[PDB]
Structure 1
Amino acid sequence: GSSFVHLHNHTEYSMLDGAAKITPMLAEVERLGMPAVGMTDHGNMFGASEFYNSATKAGIKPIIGVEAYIAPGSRFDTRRILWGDPSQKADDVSGSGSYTHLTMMAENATGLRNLFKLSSHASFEGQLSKWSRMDAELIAEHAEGIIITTGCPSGEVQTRLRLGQDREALEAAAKWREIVGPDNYFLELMDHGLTIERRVRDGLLEIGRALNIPPLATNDCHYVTRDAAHNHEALLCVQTGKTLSDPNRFKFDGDGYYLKSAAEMRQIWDDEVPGACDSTLLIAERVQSYADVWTPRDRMPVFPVPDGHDQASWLRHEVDAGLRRRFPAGPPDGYRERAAYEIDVICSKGFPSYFLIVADLISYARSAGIRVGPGRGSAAGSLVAYALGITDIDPIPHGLLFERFLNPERTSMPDIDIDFDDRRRGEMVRYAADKWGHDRVAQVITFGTIKTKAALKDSARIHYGQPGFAIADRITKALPPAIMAKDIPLSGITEAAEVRGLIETDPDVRTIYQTARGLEGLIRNAGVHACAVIMSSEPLTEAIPLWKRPQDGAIITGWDYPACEAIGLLKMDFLGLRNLTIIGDAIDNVRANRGIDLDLESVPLDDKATYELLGRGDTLGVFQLDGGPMRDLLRRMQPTGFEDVVAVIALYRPGPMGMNAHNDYADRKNNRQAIKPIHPELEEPLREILAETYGLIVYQEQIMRIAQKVASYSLARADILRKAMGKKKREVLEKEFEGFSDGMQANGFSPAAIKALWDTILPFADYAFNKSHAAGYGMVSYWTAYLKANYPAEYMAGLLTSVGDDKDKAAVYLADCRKLGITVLPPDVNESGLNFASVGQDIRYGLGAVRNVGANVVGSLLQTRNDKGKFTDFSDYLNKIDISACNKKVTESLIKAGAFDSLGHARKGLFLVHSDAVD
């Protein structure tokens, strides 16, 4: 009654502009005892999911909206438009004639949905430079359920006022009021005692009176608290690229832009403009539950099947076909029944479409010559996955467990992902969009959060400018090295640090460190995730806000992938792997240099050569086996079969190493150590389950097999035990020990045997390794070793190609080449191609491997070298090439790289000759 709600408010998702993080904002909102809060971010609704959930979870009522950017003309119009005289630039259309602000809020779930797509359309259609803009025409099409206002000072109505254009201001206000309706338009009033706001206040209340618009007090909060104001000021500097000293920069006036208490707020408005604060409460109480928007709906695409099938029929049909291909002279024994079991679970859980989709993507990759992976994750324990080509690991010969993948007794979404040649993700993503709908497939946003290291570089540019680099560079070196891609949380220095001393010493560094903490974990920008993609049965604008990446036109989700899946959108990882690129290249090299045409999918898994190579530990550049201590272990282990490859991958991790499991495995395998039983009563019942791993427990699947044998568990229920012994919640451990123990009692085991097993498994289950993932990786390792062992030059060539023009990474493999007796010939205009090549027994340097040279240009060189070349001499090269300053920048680097020495002319010469040629 004498309370208040902030409706105009900027979150950290007003990137580089709002400094109010949602969690502290809610905290504050509550101790000020306020019933509700709004979210009004500049130009986007990326925080909506977070805000809604956080607000709801704290019983504050969320008001969700957006401070739209509105074009001065049509949103499609990319001309800049100004309404006053140049002498009034500072009062005129923001963004130099690009936009005005508009505060918009959702009264109910219809309005929310409408705001989502109004946002989306702003980006799809109304983009000028960095601003996504709506216009009046577009907003009118989607006005239902929305409340708008007359706006902040950067709004249209005030801009008009400030400009002297009273007629236009009043006319603007009537246009907007007409569009949303008399009951959803408010006269927005804001006071930070600035003279910009006072100038307009009278004109403004005139308009309110004239057109009959209620007043609304708001604060345009850009930070939570009053002390936070200084951090806000530094943030704006990161956004502007300007100095704190530099007075001319964009900044706010004093510190009024926090979440003021009902009291302070009523103190400003009650006497001055009766009703303003009360309207906030009228609005808050008017606002509905948004919950229909976050209610999960099954939005998984429906694979289109031939006529007279359904998803389940078609899956059977396809799985059958699959087995036929895979086992062309009849599938072996027990396969069909396994398949039928899986198909049955799958249909039962409602996932046949998903399988069909991933199959179809894999199908396309092959039709297009895109190398896919043998597959990763849980899916490798599914005979269906294997049948359909989703994986290439037959789960049966490797003893992988379907119920680890899809547990019939738990309801939950499996992860079925493609993974392929890193250089071809583009095509894969485009294909998906074509197949499933351009308005139904989107890549997923990531949020660029300000990290510790760039926080400091930022803090320095803020205090010092361009010359700030020195101090900046100075601070950053003092830093402990990473772990291994994660620099030390700043607050943390509140520790192996010398630098800490650096601050206690230098007063300037204390102030840079201070400013950087104010900056940490705010959001710098929006990225596109490396691999996640979201798909839907319905247009995605119906579910979530989205945006268009300006550079390529890519459509990206507004929320991250957990928020998306949280409401029943399908997410898949379209993963690009470079080892797959390297594999494809080595294979190509073998076609070219040896005329063999290798098909990895049919390489034996027992190749003597390979295991020999493994035994030496000459694994530089073989997938997952290159580490130093890895090489040691491989040597100590003398691997001999595929299962050993699968084990090292699992064993070369901190958990098993902590237990010495890897060395133990090695030693036991080579008769240097006896195989200890978990307990004597346990020896014979568990012997075969643990045999392959020389009596040690290495995989999740073994925990399951163990619980089934000894405790009479379902594989499904053993899966559930395994998950739980992983999480370690007392209440659940005890129910489960109850069960485990009872089962073992029933099977006749002493309390000692039960206690041994339990005690062994319990810590081991924190870290136990998913055997399906180890087989998938293992396959790639082995394949990779097989190529190095049997095709050294072809493979090393592929490897070096992947290292780009980086001399440092290259020097690592060149050293390897040398240690294997492979000769490395230099870059050459007549003999080098774009990438490194296998030439007989040699590697020939890649042309693109030199500085300043890329496929783009090398392409035309090889082009012309085919039509007319080889080049006879430097001037012949010039006569065969073309006139261009850019062409000259290239030519220079090729000379340096000695690409021309083949011709037999000193290079100092050629530089001089090149300059004339250009003139």
Structure 2
Amino acid sequence: VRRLETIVEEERRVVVQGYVFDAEVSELKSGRTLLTMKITDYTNSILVKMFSRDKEDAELMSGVKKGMWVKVRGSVQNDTFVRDLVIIANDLNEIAANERQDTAPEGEKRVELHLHTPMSQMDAVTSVTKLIEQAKKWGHPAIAVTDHAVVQSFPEAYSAAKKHGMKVIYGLEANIVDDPFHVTLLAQNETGLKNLFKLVSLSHIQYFHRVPRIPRSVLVKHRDGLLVGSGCDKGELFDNVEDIARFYDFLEVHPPDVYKPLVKDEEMIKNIIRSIVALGEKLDIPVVATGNVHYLNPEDKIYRKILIHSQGGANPLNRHELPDVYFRTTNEMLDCFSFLGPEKAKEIVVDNTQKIASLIGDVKPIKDELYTPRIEGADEEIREMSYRRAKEIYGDPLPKLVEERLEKELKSIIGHGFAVIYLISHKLVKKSLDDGYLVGSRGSVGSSFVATMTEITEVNPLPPHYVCPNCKHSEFFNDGSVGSGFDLPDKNCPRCGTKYKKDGHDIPFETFLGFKGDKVPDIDLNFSGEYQPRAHNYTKVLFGEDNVYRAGTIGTVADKTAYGFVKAYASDHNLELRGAEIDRLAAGCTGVKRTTGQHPGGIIVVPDYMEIYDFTPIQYPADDTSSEWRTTHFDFHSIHDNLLKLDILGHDDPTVIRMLQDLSGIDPKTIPTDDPDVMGIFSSTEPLGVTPEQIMCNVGTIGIPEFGTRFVRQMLEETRPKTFSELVQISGLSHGTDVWLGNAQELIQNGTCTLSEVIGCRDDIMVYLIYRGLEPSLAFKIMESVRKGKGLTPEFEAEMRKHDVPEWYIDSCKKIKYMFPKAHAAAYVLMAVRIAYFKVHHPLLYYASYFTVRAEDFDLDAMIKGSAAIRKRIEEINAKGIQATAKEKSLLTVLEVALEMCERGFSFKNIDLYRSQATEFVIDGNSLIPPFNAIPGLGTNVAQAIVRAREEGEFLSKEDLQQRGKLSKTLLEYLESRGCLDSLPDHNQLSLF
């Protein structure tokens, strides 16, 4: 039985063990089956191939899973396609993991009181879930979580606590400074827990230095409910006569090995530990043997080594070799301390450890319920706001339809405590408008007609209908035969003669709030990127400075970065590693916290009768103390269920159509949604006056948000939507993995159902399951499950089958990885159509707005040279296929729209010293003049300076332009070489004040 680190050359026969961390199966022309595994015994790893000799072995091959352990007897060959050595197996036996066993008697088990999770930035490697699971297996009565400076593992510890029935002790390793050493804080109760949240807040905010820190006095202030340990070798007392110690409720001692970096020798460490023992008995302070766990098993160490090493001589913990700090069993802990005698062994390893755990109650770090804000007048105001607005559109009294929609909608919104955020949402939209920035609708609030009446969405969820903007008469359609009111043919009020307005997308209110109101949705708004910060700030004014917080995020090491760290470490250590082994080192690194950041837009609202510390600590994103916003210490996901969120988002659609409006004088709300020429671009280039050959594309949607992508263009080619609601079906099908490809697309092509019958929004799942007989709340639950890509449980399938829901439909639900709500699809489609109207009728406005707002990657020389030149760049990038760099892809998107622009008869002029603007593409006859910031290296600040300076006074020489415009040599050259500066002298022979 060979360890995998000894497999080094081709070799006739080896027997090998290892965890299978990857397994796939494929079929050969011959009919034979091939199993391909990666396995590691944790000294190294290797790829393994096995060739089936019969269908019995072929199916056993399918039984091999990630997580199994396997003994393989095989040959070792160079595989020249995988470019590494590889085992060709003829023998595979599954085997026990036979892992470290905790052999002490039941009730005589150890409790770990000092332990680090992947949340100890770049320092610890095994997830808290795995650790807690291991403690459970070992029979530990409890386990502690004590991360450095943070409590970000709490949410996951809790979950695992409940799933596994393990008692968790919620703690902190804190940096205390006297008014810079380590202590262990263990929370005994909610008081303690809130004090923890507080201390981590103060340490990240008022007292952050290079590292979150806590003055001792502030610790004392917030000590109630905490047990304080003297902790580490970087502890106060280990770092040495006696008063210091009386400060701790417990005294820590690590296994002698853990201290090995140094002191004279192991015998002295051993002495120091014995004096801490002397001290503890002397002062009646329990002494505890703690592990300082930074990973599960002895071998997991290498992952910690790789992370730490990535930091460089900057961390200098790389100065010394790293201690064995794995999760030690209760029998092995005794072994480590056998030198103190068997009575003291048992005392500090189990009796005292157990005793400290006994002093800890059962704390719930994350709350169960939702706490909802109160602002006097709100329930009342949302009611009147919406009845008033509804009456002026639909008449007095209201049609039964509308009236019933409002009654049912309000009692839910009001009763489940959402009236406040509707209102705050309405003011945000109102102020943005008044400030000159229109707002784009998004997400599930468009399922709510009250939301429509409060002008928080442009989406009207009522069934399709005509309404007169004058006489107010209404015509609704519930035949279901008509998809969206926007599909209706233009018509006149048969009563006043006035031309009818059309609306209604037939969306059920429940998509938003469900039936129980056990769901907590949010309100999503698309503000323009330029405006987003201001909308954010307005919520401070509305709720008060201390009752809102930006949701914070935790940046972890994901695959690409992990791979990056491992390769470098290999390189620096001169290791030649196999793909398989690099893979497995990579995997052991992912999950580890590297930084913190900011939710892209969500603001979390704290009810005035609670406080943020009932829910999470707070801090600064990335620890920037000059940040305008404080962030939540837990991310939004951990507290999803406790506080409402306003998704105040940034998006280009509002900005673009704002510019389209400010350039044309046209009110986008007046734009028709059934303009044949506009809608034609979704299935043809005709409306654009160009050939498919001319623009290398069969449909007219280049540049159109969502629809301009290569994937979506292809979908359009095959579906040819013309109707608003057909576009809405496509919007749904084109967003989310396994929605179209391998799912709907096949169902349509098999003829197993029609385009319109295929599942195109989460709503249709609910509406159809109710139709088919199921209980609405259950139909809701099922919709919610598939649209989160969670598939179907057995109970769901059973309820579906029991109601004649066809197998192809059930099977289609199980595929969907993600899925729009109809209201979002309608909102986006409406936005895309408004823009399309400019693409078609005001092309230059469309392009000026596109390159101004959306593009950030150019090849200006190509663009200026024109059609043939652009085409050549594009073909260059096409040749690279899916081997194109993210940036080439970004550029390809923009060149595609340049080539189309040029073919439609327009063009690009060179940067122009006196006509170019800073950041905006301007219209000049049939051209666009590029702005300065389009030049590579020339970013916004310089662009703005060049314009400022020129407005202060024109440029008298290249030199003058360089000084006043703040231009580097390279940038100056850029302009020179292109003839931009030709009309200027290099320098002036005079200069005056």
Q: Same fold (TM over 0.5)?
A: yes
| 1:300 aligned residue | 372
Trace 1:443-454 onto structure 2 (pairs within 5 A).
443-454=550-561
CA 220–762 in structure 1, closer or farther in 2 if over 3 Å, else same: closer
Structure 1 SS opposite 2:238: helix
**How far 1:371 sits from its partner (Å)?**
3.2
Q: In percent, how many aligned pairs have the same letter?
A: 23
| One-letter amino acid of the structure 1 residue matched with residue 644 of structure 2 | L
**How far 1:643 sits from its partner (Å)?**
2.2
**How far 1:639 sits from its partner (Å)?**
4.5
**How far 1:69 sits from its partner (Å)?**
0.8
Identify the match of residue 296 of structure 2 among 224, 230, 234: 224
CA 839–524 in structure 1, closer or farther in 2 if over 3 Å, else same: same
| 2:188 aligned residue | 107
Structure 1 SS opposite 2:911: coil
Identify the match of residue 771 of structure 1 among 805, 808, 822: 822
**How far 1:141 sits from its partner (Å)?**
1.2
Unpaired stretches in structure 2, ≥5 consecutive residues: 1-106, 264-268, 463-503, 686-698, 860-887
Deviations 1:274-298 (A, max 9, x none): 232221110112210003x433243
Identify the match of residue 856 of structure 2 among 788, 804, 813: 804
State yes or no: 1:379 paired with 2:438: no
Could you tell me how far apart the structure 2 residues matched to 1:510 and 1:730 are? 37
Could you tell me how far apart the structure 1 residues matched to 2:752 and 2:150 are? 61
| 2:840 aligned residue | 789
| 1:530 aligned residue | 600
Structure 1 SS opposite 2:452: helix
Question: Is the CA contact 1:651–1:662 (under 8 Å) kept in the aligned structure 2?
Answer: no
Question: Is the CA contact 2:251–2:288 (under 8 Å) kept in the aligned structure 1?
Answer: yes
**How far 1:460 sits from its partner (Å)?**
2.2
Structure 1 SS opposite 2:170: strand
State yes or no: 1:582 paired with 2:659: no
RMSD: 3.5
Deviations 1:143-175 (A, max 9, x none): 11100122211112233x1xxxx4xxx34334x
Could you tell me how far apart the structure 1 residues matched to 2:567 and 2:406 are? 62
| 1:276 aligned residue | 348
| 2:390 aligned residue | 323
Deviations 1:636-690 (A, max 9, x none): 655543223223323446544546669969xxxxxxx9xx997xxxxxxxxxxx9
Could you tell me how far apart the structure 1 residues matched to 2:380 and 2:583 are? 63
Trace 1:136-175 onto structure 2 (pairs within 5 A).
136-159=216-239, 161=240, 166=241, 170-174=242-246
Structure 2 SS opposite 1:901: coil
Trace 1:363-762 onto structure 2 (pairs within 5 A).
363-373=430-440, 375-396=441-462, 397-409=504-516, 411-465=518-572, 507=577, 512-537=582-607, 538-549=610-621, 550-551=623-624, 552-553=626-627, 554-566=629-641, 568-588=642-662, 590=663, 596-614=664-682, 615-616=684-685, 617-628=699-710, 630-634=712-716, 639-652=721-734, 654-656=738-740, 658=742, 698-706=760-768, 719=780, 722=783, 727-738=791-802, 740=803, 755=804, 758-759=806-807, 761-762=809-810
Q: Give 1 or 2: higher helix fraction.
A: 1
Structure 2 SS opposite 1:38: strand
Q: How many residues are matched?
A: 771
Could you tell me how far apart the structure 2 residues matched to 1:770 and 1:62 are? 39
| 1:863 aligned residue | 948
Structure 2 SS opposite 1:731: helix
State yes or no: 1:259 paired with 2:327: yes
Q: Give 1 or 2: higher strand fraction.
A: 2
**How far 1:258 sits from its partner (Å)?**
1.3
**How far 1:66 sits from its partner (Å)?**
0.5
| One-letter amino acid of the structure 2 residue matched with residue 771 of structure 1 | K
Trace 1:180-195 onto structure 2 (pairs within 5 A).
184-186=249-251, 188=253, 190-192=255-257, 194=260
Question: Is the CA contact 1:630–1:652 (under 8 Å) kept in the aligned structure 2?
Answer: yes
Q: Which has the higher contact order (CA 8 A, sep 6+)?
A: 1
Could you tell me how far apart the structure 1 residues matched to 2:748 and 2:252 are? 76
Could you tell me how far apart the structure 2 residues matched to 1:22 and 1:348 are? 38
| One-letter amino acid of the structure 2 residue matched with residue 804 of structure 1 | E
Question: Is the CA contact 2:976–2:982 (under 8 Å) kept in the aligned structure 1?
Answer: no
Question: Is the CA contact 2:158–2:168 (under 8 Å) kept in the aligned structure 1?
Answer: yes
Question: Is the CA contact 2:535–2:648 (under 8 Å) kept in the aligned structure 1?
Answer: yes
| One-letter amino acid of the structure 1 residue matched with residue 217 of structure 2 | E
| 1:31 aligned residue | 137
Deviations 1:670-716 (A, max 9, x none): xxx9xx997xxxxxxxxxxx9xx76666455445555566x567766
CA 334–328 in structure 1, closer or farther in 2 if over 3 Å, else same: closer
CA 418–899 in structure 1, closer or farther in 2 if over 3 Å, else same: farther
| One-letter amino acid of the structure 2 residue matched with residue 288 of structure 1 | G
Could you tell me how far apart the structure 1 residues matched to 2:285 and 2:565 are? 45
Structure 1 SS opposite 2:650: strand
Could you tell me how far apart the structure 2 residues matched to 1:914 and 1:215 are? 82
Structure 2 SS opposite 1:41: coil
**How far 1:513 sits from its partner (Å)?**
4.4
Could you tell me how far apart the structure 1 residues matched to 2:394 and 2:981 are? 56
Question: Is the CA contact 2:921–2:929 (under 8 Å) kept in the aligned structure 1?
Answer: yes
Could you tell me how far apart the structure 2 residues matched to 1:315 and 1:586 are? 33
| One-letter amino acid of the structure 1 residue matched with residue 356 of structure 2 | I
Question: Is the CA contact 1:45–1:65 (under 8 Å) kept in the aligned structure 2?
Answer: yes
Identify the match of residue 341 of structure 1 among 400, 408, 411: 408
State yes or no: 1:896 paired with 2:948: no
| One-letter amino acid of the structure 2 residue matched with residue 439 of structure 1 | D
Could you tell me how far apart the structure 1 residues matched to 2:582 and 2:740 are? 43
Could you tell me how far apart the structure 1 residues matched to 2:273 and 2:138 are? 28
Query: Is the deviation greater in 545-554 or in 389-398?
Result: 545-554
| 1:751 aligned residue | none
Could you tell me how far apart the structure 2 residues matched to 1:314 and 1:645 are? 36
Could you tell me how far apart the structure 1 residues matched to 2:672 and 2:394 are? 16
**How far 1:251 sits from its partner (Å)?**
4.5
Structure 2 SS opposite 1:828: coil
State yes or no: 1:52 paired with 2:195: no
Could you tell me how far apart the structure 2 residues matched to 1:433 and 1:120 are? 19
TM-score (norm 2): 0.71
Could you tell me how far apart the structure 2 residues matched to 1:406 and 1:706 are? 18
| 2:916 aligned residue | 832
**How far 1:560 sits from its partner (Å)?**
2.4
Deviations 1:59-113 (A, max 9, x none): 221111110011244xxxxxxxxxxxxxxxxxxxxxxxxx211111112221122
Query: Is the deviation greater in 188-197 or in 832-841?
Result: 188-197
| 1:360 aligned residue | 427
Deviations 1:714-747 (A, max 9, x none): 7666545655788432333334544x3xxxxxxx
Could you tell me how far apart the structure 1 residues matched to 2:220 and 2:335 are? 36
CA 220–663 in structure 1, closer or farther in 2 if over 3 Å, else same: closer
TM-score (norm 1): 0.76
